[PDB]
């Protein structure tokens, strides 16, 4: 089915670095240059107050829509990733259900400005106080802390490409039918990422990457807070949340 489902040579690993970086560039959603340029465009005190005055349900709906748009780009990234389309549909869905939000959380560090602790949201940069109407302050503060910690690594776009391919191709996800195929694809993607770090003298980031439990905790907290919101506003979730978001986080 795929060359990367077996042992790959050094030349094949070099090809894989290029393929993963290309897949990421083509599906990155927003250009890094565009996010950096917009750092000076910050919501005013008046604009922050307006977001704070929004209802809890209208703010949840807006955030669920923005997350779903980000997730759609991650699904396209997965489809372009060498080997992913050669996995069975059961496994593609297991990997995306478990990993799409983790990839969005990693990609989000590009949109996070560590200098003033702001994130790009709806056209300008705002701090965690922008999201106060959601009623999930611990989860927002945890996402901002995570972005802050990844921002301190000064990732290049190629490092995010290779790190997110690995976040997605995780042979430990429960439910995989072709586990040995995913294990080999994961091994080759790990070699591609580590080869790139070695070549660019960036192997020092390996001990600094967050543990898997960190991404798991963030995803667990998101599903828990969604369950709380859904109990409060069940018809908002049924009637106005995106179908893809419900498929990933509220069992359809």
């Amino acid at each position: 089915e795929n060359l990367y489902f077996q042992g790959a040579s050094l030349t094949e690993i070099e090809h894989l670095v290029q393929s993963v970086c290309k897949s990421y560039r083509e599906t990155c959603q927003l250009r890094l240059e565009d996010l950096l340029r917009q750092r000076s465009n910050i919501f005013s005190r008046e604009e922050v107050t307006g977001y704070q005055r929004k209802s809890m349900w209208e703010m949840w709906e807006r955030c669920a829509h923005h997350l779903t748009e980000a997730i759609q780009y991650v699904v396209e990234f997965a489809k372009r990733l060498s080997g992913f389309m050669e996995l069975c549909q059961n496994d593609q869905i297991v990997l995306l259900k478990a990993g799409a939000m983790e990839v969005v959380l990693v990609r989000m560090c590009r949109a996070y400005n560590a200098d003033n602790r702001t994130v790009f949201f709806e056209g300008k940069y705002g701090g965690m106080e922008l999201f106060r109407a959601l009623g999930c302050s611990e989860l927002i503060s945890s996402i901002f802390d995570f972005s802050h910690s990844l921002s301190a690594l000064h990732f290049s776009e190629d490092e995010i490409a290779l790190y997110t391919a690995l976040v997605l191709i995780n042979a430990h996800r429960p439910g995989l039918q072709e586990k040995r195929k995913v294990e080999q694809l994961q091994y080759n993607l790990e070699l591609a990422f580590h080869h790139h770090l070695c070549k660019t003298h960036r192997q020092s980031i390996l001990a600094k990457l967050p543990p898997k439990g960190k991404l798991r905790s963030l995803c667990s907290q998101h599903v828990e807070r969604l369950q709380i919101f859904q109990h409060l506003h069940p018809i908002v979730v049924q009637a106005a949340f995106p179908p893809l978001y419900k498929e990933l986080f509220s069992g359809g």
């Binding site: 489809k79 549909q89 593609q92 869905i93 995306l96 259900k97 893809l244 419900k246 498929e247 359809g252």
Partner: peptide, 12 residues
């Protein structure tokens, strides 16, 4: 019972 992933995966 929303199933969108199957659609996105099969759409070429």
């Amino acid at each position: 019972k929303h199933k969108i992933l199957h659609r996105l995966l099969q759409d070429s």
